[PDB]
Each structure stands twice: as structure tokens, then as C-alpha cells.
Design an enzyme around this catalytic site. Structure first.
Site, short mmCIF file in Angstrom:
data_model
loop_
_atom_site.label_atom_id
_atom_site.label_comp_id
_atom_site.label_asym_id
_atom_site.label_seq_id
_atom_site.Cartn_x
_atom_site.Cartn_y
_atom_site.Cartn_z
N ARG A 185 40.49 47.91 46.82
CA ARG A 185 40.65 49.24 47.35
C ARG A 185 39.59 49.61 48.37
O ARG A 185 39.88 50.16 49.42
CB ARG A 185 40.66 50.24 46.18
CG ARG A 185 41.92 49.93 45.39
CD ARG A 185 42.33 50.72 44.17
NE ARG A 185 42.95 51.97 44.48
CZ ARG A 185 44.15 52.44 44.01
NH1 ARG A 185 45.02 51.86 43.19
NH2 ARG A 185 44.45 53.68 44.39
N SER A 204 49.48 46.20 37.59
CA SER A 204 49.34 45.22 36.52
C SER A 204 48.19 45.55 35.57
O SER A 204 48.20 45.12 34.41
CB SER A 204 49.12 43.86 37.12
OG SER A 204 50.34 43.43 37.70
N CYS A 205 47.19 46.33 36.02
CA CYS A 205 46.08 46.79 35.19
C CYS A 205 46.54 47.62 34.00
O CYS A 205 45.80 47.66 33.01
CB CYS A 205 45.08 47.68 35.98
SG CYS A 205 44.77 46.92 37.59
N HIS A 263 46.75 46.89 45.41
CA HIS A 263 45.54 47.67 45.66
C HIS A 263 44.91 47.57 47.03
O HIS A 263 44.51 48.61 47.58
CB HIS A 263 44.49 47.31 44.63
CG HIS A 263 44.84 47.75 43.20
ND1 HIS A 263 44.63 48.95 42.63
CD2 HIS A 263 45.39 46.92 42.23
CE1 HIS A 263 45.01 48.89 41.37
NE2 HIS A 263 45.45 47.67 41.15
C1 FAD Z 1 46.76 41.87 33.79
C2 FAD Z 1 45.67 42.29 34.80
C3 FAD Z 1 44.74 43.22 34.44
C4 FAD Z 1 43.81 43.68 35.38
N1 FAD Z 1 43.07 44.77 35.02
C5 FAD Z 1 42.19 45.21 35.91
C6 FAD Z 1 41.43 46.37 35.56
O1 FAD Z 1 41.65 46.97 34.50
N2 FAD Z 1 40.46 46.77 36.49
C7 FAD Z 1 40.34 46.13 37.72
O2 FAD Z 1 39.48 46.51 38.52
N3 FAD Z 1 41.11 45.11 38.08
C8 FAD Z 1 41.99 44.61 37.20
N4 FAD Z 1 42.76 43.54 37.54
C9 FAD Z 1 42.57 42.92 38.88
C10 FAD Z 1 43.37 43.63 39.98
O3 FAD Z 1 44.70 43.77 39.49
C11 FAD Z 1 43.34 42.82 41.30
O4 FAD Z 1 41.98 42.60 41.63
C12 FAD Z 1 44.06 43.47 42.50
O5 FAD Z 1 45.43 43.69 42.17
C13 FAD Z 1 44.07 42.62 43.77
O6 FAD Z 1 44.82 43.33 44.84
P1 FAD Z 1 45.36 42.57 46.03
O7 FAD Z 1 45.97 43.56 46.96
O8 FAD Z 1 44.27 41.76 46.59
O9 FAD Z 1 46.42 41.55 45.45
P2 FAD Z 1 47.65 41.49 44.45
O10 FAD Z 1 47.61 42.51 43.36
O11 FAD Z 1 47.80 40.11 44.04
O12 FAD Z 1 48.83 41.86 45.28
C14 FAD Z 1 49.34 41.08 46.47
C15 FAD Z 1 50.62 41.80 46.87
O13 FAD Z 1 51.06 41.33 48.15
C16 FAD Z 1 52.39 40.83 48.06
N5 FAD Z 1 52.58 39.70 49.00
C17 FAD Z 1 51.93 38.49 49.02
N6 FAD Z 1 52.29 37.70 50.00
C18 FAD Z 1 53.25 38.38 50.72
C19 FAD Z 1 53.92 38.06 51.91
N7 FAD Z 1 53.57 36.97 52.60
N8 FAD Z 1 54.72 39.00 52.41
C20 FAD Z 1 54.79 40.19 51.79
N9 FAD Z 1 54.24 40.61 50.65
C21 FAD Z 1 53.40 39.67 50.13
C22 FAD Z 1 52.53 40.40 46.60
O14 FAD Z 1 53.91 40.45 46.20
C23 FAD Z 1 51.77 41.54 45.86
O15 FAD Z 1 52.63 42.70 45.70
C24 FAD Z 1 43.70 43.06 36.66
C25 FAD Z 1 44.59 42.02 36.98
C26 FAD Z 1 45.61 41.69 36.10
C27 FAD Z 1 46.67 40.70 36.53
#
Ligand code: FAD
EC number: 1.11.1.1
Length: 447
Positions: free
Chosen positions: A303, A41-42, A10
Site C-alpha cells: 500500500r 486474503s488477509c 493492495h
Molecule cells: C492468507 C494471507 C494472509 C495475509 N495476512 C496479512 C495480514 O494480516 N497483514 C499483512 O500486512 N499482510 C498479510 N498478507 C500479505 C498481503 O496479502 C500481501 O503482502 C499483499 O496482498 C501483496 O499485494 P500485491 O498487490 O503486491 O499482490 P497480490 O495480492 O498478490 O495481488 C496481485 C494481483 O494482481 C493480479 N494480476 C497479476 N498478474 C496480472 C496480469 N498480468 N494482468 C492482470 N492482473 C494481474 C492478481 O490476480 C492479483 O489480483 C497475507 C497474505 C495471505 C495470502
């Protein structure tokens, strides 16, 4: 101008979108260490319960589509390190093993969080699963139809743990939810709501074991028992949903981190180093109900931070407006939503609040479709400004929490909401709708 974005989830994804409409010209590299771009994953609960049949469609973007738009997508490519002074990152292609150094003009990282594991004896016997990403989604689905799985234990009674408990109970399994906290979903809801929800889950044979510390997993090869300080539970499968760790240990020494591992950023998403921005679960976000920075790991936050990082790419011109922590979910027949300060948040922050709770039918008495609704309005004792609200019903009234989130951000008071203009039509609500009614109660309590 060359921008490297780390992560296809996201936060990284919206940074690429805003780059495409604010800097169409730019050379954009998008890196993902995993194999699948933008798995949602949501949406894992909809897939586990059979609502969505194809796991590969639970996504919001593909590398192919981003490449049509001129982005260089690199999956199975990990950013191993950042060299912020020389503006370079070292990247490792995970299928060939080849490392290389890449230069950037701006770097946006959204490295996310990892599932926390209990590091206790038994730590990994087989069938102790986690819940995040495609691979765990697939493994969890196979267990839903496994005739050998009769007892599943999920550790953690928050949002994710209750989604896993509902999905295995609906697959016909016996589920026990264990946690050290005394109420399920306390981070989102107060006791009058989680009391109703506990009865509802117990009606669908979910046992909630609160106030216990898991000590060890027991079993031969694979898990068979989970033992706590107070009890031992048979388990054919354990889902550990206790929380999440920021994926930042690789950054120690490169960027300033808070003691708990989160990246330090300011209101323009800037880290301690020039030209690198950080967004998403690995950061703190401005929390308007209490005017402070809090870690609120939600997709909506990542986002919005992702787009604000691009708005501030060149000059710190657009401070982030802050969020209220809004969340929503259905637990069997109940649909709830909440925003802002509730009891556990007020405790953590040392904030004093007052609150009124109304529970009554949301339609007029003559209407046969009427159903009970619960609404709790939390407000400041001195100013009477709105600080939070929680609502629940078997009817879907959850979009009303969107008005409360705006009410908090505009600093409106209980009096503003008691007489705010909300429509009336008797198939949809009462002359004083759910928000009006609770705010009228609060005004009377302060009279
Ligand atoms: C089961 C579940 C249900 C959820 N439901 C909701 C919901 O319904 N509503 C809501 O608002 N939120 C929900 N959330 C929370 C939401 O999914 C997270 O807040 C959001 O995904 C965070 O985004 P992010 O980009 O910070 O990190 P992440 O989703 O953790 O993604 C990080 C990404 O970066 C990649 N990455 C990391 N390090 C490296 C590296 N060094 N090199 C290259 N790539 C790398 C990882 O592989 C991953 O693809 C839920 C979470 C889960 C697990």
C-alpha cells in the site's frame, strides 16, 4: 495523461487511490485478470472461523464504486506483455479471448506472488489445497464442515500456515503442521515466544512436526498420506503454505529481475525501464533496522509503495522512507506483535544484536485483572540504538509495537525509551509501562 495500473490487490489499489487525489484529470485504466476486484486474503481466517459469514464482503473495493469515480476497471482482463520502449501493453480479455494493444503514458504494476507448490510425487492428488484468494477461501471453508475430513496436514509453519492450522483445529479437525524449520513462526518471533505458542497449539491438538522434509504425497485419486524423511502422516486434506513465488516469469526479458525473480526497483519505485513502476510482493523494500533492501511481503508495504509510485510519477522527488517489517497476529488466546530485527533476521543479515526479555504481569499486583506479558527489546551492542522488539500476552498490548517501529525509524536508543513519557493509570499499565521496563533492564545490563 493515461496511467495503466496492473492488479486490484493492495499495491495496485493504493496506486489508483493516490492517482485519484494527485491526478484527478488523468485517464486511469485498472486491470485485474481475475474475476473479483480486491478480495482481502488477509481476512480469510475470519471467514474460515465463521466470524464473517459472507465471503464476498471480505473485500475493500468494488469495480462499480471505482467506475463511479471515473476509473476504467477491466476485470477478467490480463496484461500479457509489456512493450516498454513503445509504451504499450498487450491485454487479453479472458471471457471473449480478444487481445488488444493499449498505449500508456505511465504504467504501475503490482503483479504480486503466487503460492509455492512442492513439486514432489503425488503433487496433485485431490485435496492438496493452497491459501490465497477467493476461490481457495471458498474451497477451504467447505472442507471445514466436511465429515470425511478428519486429519489435515499443513506444510509451512509461518504466518499463513499457523492461520490455517488454527482455523481447522477450531473446526474440530486433527491438525499436523510440518516444516523443515525448527520452530513455528521463527521469522516473526524468537524461541522464548514460540515455545509458549507451541504449548498453546499442542493444547488445542495441533501436532507440530519440525525438522522434516516432505518427500511425497500418497493416496489413490486423492491424498491419504504425506511422507517425510522421518515419518508418514495420514492426511485427508493438505494445505501447502510453504511460501510464495513472485508472479514475474512473464516479465523476463522485459524488465530487469533479481536472480530470485523479484523486480529491480529503486527508492522511487522505478524499474529498469522509463515510465514503468513496480510495487508490492514482487519487489524489495527499504528496511530501516538494517539499512538494506529486503523482500517483506506484507499488505502495509504494498500500500505505501503504491502511493509512492504515484508521487514519483513525473519526477523522482520523494524517496521511500523505509519500513521496519511490523506484523501482528492472534494465535488462540495469545496476541503477539513484532517489528525490526529478531534472531532469524539477524542471522540472515549477519548483524550482531543484544536483547533483554521481560516476562511479568503488566498491571500492578493489587489489580485482579493482571496477566503476564512477554516483551523482548533488541538493540545494537555498540550504539544501543533500538533494532527490534517482540511482545505477547493474552491481553491485547499489541499497539505498543507501533511506538517501537517509530523508535527504530528515529534511531532512538535504550536510554531514550527507558525514560520516554508513556502515560500511567492503574487499570491500563504500571508506572513504568512495558516498553519502559524492558529499556530500564537494557540500561542496567549496559551499566
Ligand atoms: C492468507 C494471507 C494472509 C495475509 N495476512 C496479512 C495480514 O494480516 N497483514 C499483512 O500486512 N499482510 C498479510 N498478507 C500479505 C498481503 O496479502 C500481501 O503482502 C499483499 O496482498 C501483496 O499485494 P500485491 O498487490 O503486491 O499482490 P497480490 O495480492 O498478490 O495481488 C496481485 C494481483 O494482481 C493480479 N494480476 C497479476 N498478474 C496480472 C496480469 N498480468 N494482468 C492482470 N492482473 C494481474 C492478481 O490476480 C492479483 O489480483 C497475507 C497474505 C495471505 C495470502
Amino acid at each position: 495523461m493515461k496511467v495503466i495500473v496492473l492488479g486490484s490487490s493492495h499495491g495496485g489499489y493504493e496506486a489508483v487511490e493516490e492517482l485519484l487525489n494527485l491526478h484527478p484529470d488523468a485517464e486511469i485504466q485498472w486491470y485485474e485478470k481475475g474475476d473479483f476486484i480486491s478480495f482481502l486474503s488477509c481476512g480469510m481466517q475470519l471467514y474460515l472461523e465463521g466470524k464473517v459469514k459472507d465471503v464476498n464482503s471480505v473485500r475493500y473495493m468494488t469495480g462499480e464504486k471505482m467506475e463511479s469515480r471515473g476509473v476504467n476497471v477491466f476485470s477478467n482482463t490480463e496484461i500479457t506483455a509489456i512493450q516498454p520502449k513503445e509504451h504499450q501493453v498487450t491485454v487479453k480479455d479472458l471471457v471473449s479471448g480478444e487481445e488488444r494493444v493499449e498505449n500508456y503514458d505511465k504504467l504501475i504494476i503490482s503483479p504480486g506472488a503466487v503460492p509455492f507448490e512442492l513439486d514432489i510425487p503425488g503433487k496433485d492428488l485431490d485435496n492438496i489445497y493452497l491459501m490465497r484468494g477467493r476461490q481457495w477461501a471458498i474451497k477451504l471453508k467447505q472442507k471445514t464442515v466436511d465429515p470425511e475430513v478428519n486429519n489435515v496436514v499443513v506444510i509451512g509453519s509461518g504466518y499463513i500456515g499457523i492461520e490455517a492450522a488454527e482455523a481447522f483445529a477450531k473446526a474440530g479437525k486433527k491438525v499436523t503442521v510440518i516444516d523443515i524449520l525448527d520452530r513455528p513462526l521463527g521469522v516473526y518471533l524468537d524461541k522464548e515466544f514460540t515455545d509458549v505458542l507451541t504449548e498453546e497449539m499442542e493444547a488445542n491438538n495441533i501436532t507440530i512436526a519440525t525438522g522434516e522434509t516432505v518427500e511425497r504425497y500418497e493416496g489413490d485419486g486423492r491424498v491419504q498420506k504425506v511422507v517425510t524423511d522421518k515419518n508418514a502422516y495420514d492426511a485427508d486434506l493438505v494445505v501447502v503454505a510453504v511460501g510464495v513465488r513472485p508472479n514475474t516469469a512473464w516479465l523476463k526479458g522485459t524488465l530487469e529481475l533479481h536472480p530470485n525473480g523479484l523486480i529491480k526497483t529503486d527508492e522511487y519505485m522505478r524499474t529498469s525501464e522509463p515510465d514503468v513502476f513496480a510495487v508490492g510482493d514482487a519487489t524489495l523494500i527499504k528496511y530501516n533496522p538494517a539499512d538494506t533492501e529486503v523482500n517483506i511481503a506484507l499488505a502495509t508495504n504494498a500500500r505505501k509503495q503504491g502511493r509512492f509510485a504515484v508521487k514519483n510519477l513525473e519526477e523522482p522527488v520523494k524517496p521511500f522512507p523505509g519500513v521496519q517489517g511490523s506484523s501482528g497476529l492472534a494465535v488462540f488466546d495469545y496476541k503477539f506483535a513484532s517489528t525490526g530485527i529478531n534472531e532469524v533476521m539477524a542471522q540472515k543479515l549477519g548483524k550482531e544484536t543484544k536483547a533483554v526479555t521481560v516476562v511479568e504481569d503488566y498491571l500492578m499486583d493489587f489489580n485482579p485483572d493482571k496477566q503476564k506479558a512477554w516483551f523482548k527489546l533488541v538493540y545494537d551492542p555498540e550504539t544501543t540504538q533500538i533494532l527490534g522488539a517482540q511482545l505477547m500476552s493474552k491481553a491485547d498490548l499489541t499497539a505498543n509495537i507501533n511506538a517501537i517501529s517509530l523508535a527504530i525509524q528515529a534511531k532512538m536508543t535504550i536510554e531514550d525509551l527507558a525514560y520516554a513519557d508513556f502515560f500511567f493509570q492503574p487499570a491500563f499499565d504500571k508506572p513504568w509501562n512495558i516498553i519502559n521496563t524492558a529499556a530500564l533492564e537494557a540500561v542496567k545490563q549496559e551499566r
